[PDB]
Paper text:
We co-purified and crystallized two different complexes of AscX and YscY, with the substrate truncated N-terminally to residue 30 (AscX31) or residue 48 (AscX49). The latter construct was designed to start with the α1 helix. AscX49–YscY crystallized with four complexes in the asymmetric unit. As the density of chain E was poor, helices α5 and α6 of this YscY monomer were not included in the final model. Refinement stalled at high R work and R free values of 29.12% and 32.62%, respectively. We attribute this to the presence of strong translational noncrystallographic symmetry (tNCS), indicated by a Patterson peak at (0.000, 0.315, 0.500) with a height of 49% of the origin peak. The four AscX49–YscY complexes in the asymmetric unit roughly follow pseudo-222 symmetry and the C-terminal α3 helices of each AscX bind each other in a four-helix bundle. The PISA server predicts either a complex containing two tetramers of the heterodimer or one such tetramer as a stable assembly in solution. Neither was observed, as AscX49–YscY showed a dominant peak during gel filtration at the expected retention volume for a 1:1 complex. Similar to our previously published structures of YscX bound to YscY, AscX is recognized by YscY at two distinct binding interfaces: (i) the α1 helix of AscX binds to the hydrophobic groove of the TPR chaperone and (ii) the C-terminal α2 and α3 helices of the substrate cap the N-terminal TPR of YscY, thereby masking a large hydrophobic surface. Interestingly, both AscX monomers showed a bend in the α3 helix at Ala106 despite the high propensity of alanine for the formation of helices. This helix bending was not observed for the lower resolution crystal structure of the shorter AscX49–YscY construct, despite an otherwise identical structure to AscX49–YscY.
Residue numbers in the entry:
A (entry chain A): 10 to 121
B (entry chain B): 48 to 64, 68 to 119
The structure:
Amino acid sequence: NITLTKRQQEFLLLNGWLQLQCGHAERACILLDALLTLNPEHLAGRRCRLVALLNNNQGERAEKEAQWLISHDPLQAGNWLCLSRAQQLNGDLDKARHAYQHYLELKDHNES
Amino acid sequence: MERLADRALLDFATPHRDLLRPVDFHQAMQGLRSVLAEGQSPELRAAAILLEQMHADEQLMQMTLHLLH
């Protein structure tokens, strides 16, 4: 079919990351949608697109992406910070507070 | 502080491993547009149209740099 080499996948992830730093959240989502279409298991591409969705005022979609990374990677504290930022954009400040609280617990439990 | 959570999100999105292409950005971009040009899904088409316009805008930059000697 249409395959992407590991060097091409990381190069496409790099371009999506460079657009995110330049305030181009829309262009970052478009590039990373193609990466996660060919390779949905790309873990680094989902984290970068999740932040790109947060900066694009798409909290209803970033919430399901943040909850996706929690089920597939529950040992990362950053997943709850994205969920806290996603649910905050959805008007659920009560749910966003619990997600931020869970982020502070995992972030402190990983440092010593 | 919200400033700490903003940087933590940027660090969370920053991927590890810049570490594969040493000033080979032009050839890596040509190969990327070629693989995405044969896509059918709207995710692959929108990314192909996006990279095509970036390459077209690159020609304006070279003409500006050429006039700057």
